[PDB]
């Protein structure tokens, strides 16, 4: 009925925004902006900048659906992103140590409860 939290947890243990959903794991992180197309976009019709604790997502000339800092450092050197159905850009973000847990996408969404139980720690 009333409005709270939009972003809600997937099986990815990440957020599902009205924007668009990415996923976050103990290995990697990874970042899906479905853009309403009805043609197959071309990597240089997209602008995808991915760095080092930074990453920007979003259609030439158009604004960047997504920018912000990281949550955390992400290999870049590794890092890479790909167009699914002509009509999605997924992002891939490979997390620096895969003993770290993501708590958002940039430093703009919202959080999300990672940890649960009733243990203090």
Same mark, same amino acid.
């Given at each position: /009925?009333?409005? /709270?939290?939009?972003?809600?947890?997937? =099986?990815?243990? /990440?957020?599902?925004?009205?924007?668009? !959903?990415?996923? $976050?794991? @103990?290995?990697? #992180?990874?970042?899906?902006?479905?853009? !309403?197309?009805?043609?197959?976009?071309? /990597?240089?019709?997209?602008? &995808?900048? %991915? $760095?080092?604790?930074? =990453?920007?997502?979003? @259609?030439?000339?158009?604004?960047?659906?997504?920018?912000? +800092? #990281?949550?955390?450092? &992400?290999?870049?050197? +590794?890092?890479?992103? =790909?167009?699914?159905?002509?009509?999605?850009?997924?992002?891939? @973000?490979?997390?620096?140590?895969?003993?770290?847990?993501?708590?958002? #996408? &940039?430093?703009?969404?919202?959080? %999300?409860?990672?940890?649960?139980?009733?243990?203090?720690?």
């Amino acid at each position: /009925g009333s409005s /709270g939290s939009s972003g809600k947890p997937n =099986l990815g243990n /990440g957020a599902d925004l009205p924007n668009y !959903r990415w996923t $976050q794991t @103990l290995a990697e #992180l990874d970042l899906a902006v479905p853009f !309403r197309v009805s043609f197959r976009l071309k /990597g240089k019709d997209v602008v &995808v900048d %991915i $760095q080092r604790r930074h =990453l920007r997502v979003g @259609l030439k000339g158009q604004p960047p659906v997504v920018d912000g +800092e #990281l949550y955390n450092e &992400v290999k870049v050197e +590794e890092s890479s992103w =790909l167009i699914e159905d002509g009509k999605v850009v997924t992002v891939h @973000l490979e997390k620096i140590n895969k003993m770290e847990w993501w708590n958002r #996408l &940039v430093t703009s969404d919202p959080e %999300i409860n990672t940890k649960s139980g009733p243990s203090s720690g």
